[PDB]
Amino acid sequence: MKSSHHHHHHENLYFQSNANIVRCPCGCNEDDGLMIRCEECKLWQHAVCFAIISEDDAPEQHVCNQCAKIVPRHMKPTDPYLTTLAPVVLQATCLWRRALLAATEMDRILVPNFSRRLGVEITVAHGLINRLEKEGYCQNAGRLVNKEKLKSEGFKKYFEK
Ligand code: NI
Ligand SMILES: [Zn+2]
Ligand SMILES: [Zn+2]
């Protein structure tokens, strides 16, 4: 068959519609890893963009960043931090989170491969990789990924609540 996101509200149901797009503050509109569907707008986001890196840590009611300013109070935004960020900062922060999770699947990072992996321009990928280097999550030079430091210190610094 074909692989793409969809929803089973009960175990004997299947719903898919091209109207339920990916719409996430990272600006990437493709499925990639763990995806989560917003309770309010029924559109899809990358869990990692909302600092969710384990399907057991994901909320049962996900409220995306667009919806955070319009749902009643009892529906908490999944990542309140994002609501405080300026738009260009917001996109850069979610992309950084995607980059951190993506780097954990690579032994070495090469700029064209990395740009394609994340769907970004080369100059953006250079910016990300130079940041990974300063943090110590990859080496200076491709660039060997320091997987242990990334998964331990890096996830603590950027994802742990
Ligand atoms: Ni399914
Ligand atoms: Zn995203
Ligand atoms: Zn929403």
Numbering used by the authors: 333 to 473, 479 to 498
Paper quotes:
In meiosis, ploidy reduction is driven by a complex series of DNA breakage and recombination events between homologous chromosomes, orchestrated by meiotic HORMA domain proteins (HORMADs). Meiotic HORMADs possess a central chromatin binding region (CBR) whose architecture varies across eukaryotic groups. Here, we determine high-resolution crystal structures of the meiotic HORMAD CBR from two diverged aquatic Holozoa, Schistosoma mansoni and Patiria miniata, which reveal tightly associated plant homeodomain (PHD) and winged helix-turn-helix (wHTH) domains. Our data reveal how meiotic HORMADs with PHD–wHTH CBRs can bind chromatin and potentially discriminate between chromatin states to drive meiotic recombination to specific chromosomal regions.
To determine these proteins’ structures and mechanisms of chromatin binding, we expressed and purified the Hop1 CBRs of two diverged aquatic Holozoa: Schistosoma mansoni (blood fluke) and P. miniata (star fish). We crystallized and determined high-resolution x-ray crystal structures of both proteins using single-wavelength anomalous diffraction (SAD) methods with the anomalous diffraction of endogenously bound Zn2+ ions. The structures show CBRs with PHD and wHTH domain tightly packed on one another in an overall configuration similar to that of the budding yeast Hop1 CBR, but lacking the HTH-C extension seen in that protein. The S. mansoni and P. miniata Hop1 CBRs are 43% identical at the amino acid level, and are nearly identical in structure, with an overall Cɑ root mean squared displacement (r.m.s.d.) of 1.4 Å over 136 residues. In contrast to the budding yeast Hop1 CBR, we find that S. mansoni and P. miniata Hop1 CBRs bind DNA via their wHTH domains through a canonical DNA binding interface. Mutation of arginine residues in each protein’s predicted DNA binding surface (R389 and R407 for S. mansoni; R463, R477, and R463 for P. miniata) to alanine resulted in a complete loss of DNA binding. We found that the P. miniata Hop1 CBR binds nucleosomes with an affinity in the low micromolar range and that alanine mutants in the PHD aromatic cage (position I residue W376) and the wHTH domain DNA binding surface (R480) each show reduced nucleosome binding. WT P. miniata Hop1 CBR bound to unmodified and H3K4me3 nucleosomes with roughly equivalent affinity, indicating the Hop1 CBR alone does not strongly discriminate between H3K4 methylation states in vitro. We also performed EMSAs with the isolated Widom 601 DNA, and observed that the wHTH domain mutant R480A, but not the PHD mutant W376A, reduced DNA binding. Overall, these data are consistent with bipartite recognition of nucleosomes by the P. miniata Hop1 CBR, with both the PHD and wHTH domain contributing to the interaction.
